[PDB]
Design a protein around this ligand. Structure first.
Ligand SMILES: [Fe+3]
Length: 53
């Protein structure tokens, strides 16, 4: 699934993960650590919104 950072537009794609910041491809958004943040703007997980209806 993909989740967008409502502040900057960054897209956390679960299939891509976030390797540079310790997240391997395939990591679900809910499993990301509670203090993981958007690699672009630094927003907390609370500011992301899943891209699903
Ligand atoms: Fe962001």
């Amino acid at each position: 699934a993909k989740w967008v950072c409502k502040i900057c537009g960054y897209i956390y794609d679960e299939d891509a993960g976030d390797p540079d910041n310790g997240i391997s491809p395939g990591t679900k958004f809910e499993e990301l650590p509670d203090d993981w943040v958007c690699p672009i703007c630094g927003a907390p997980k609370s500011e992301f919104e899943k891209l699903e209806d």
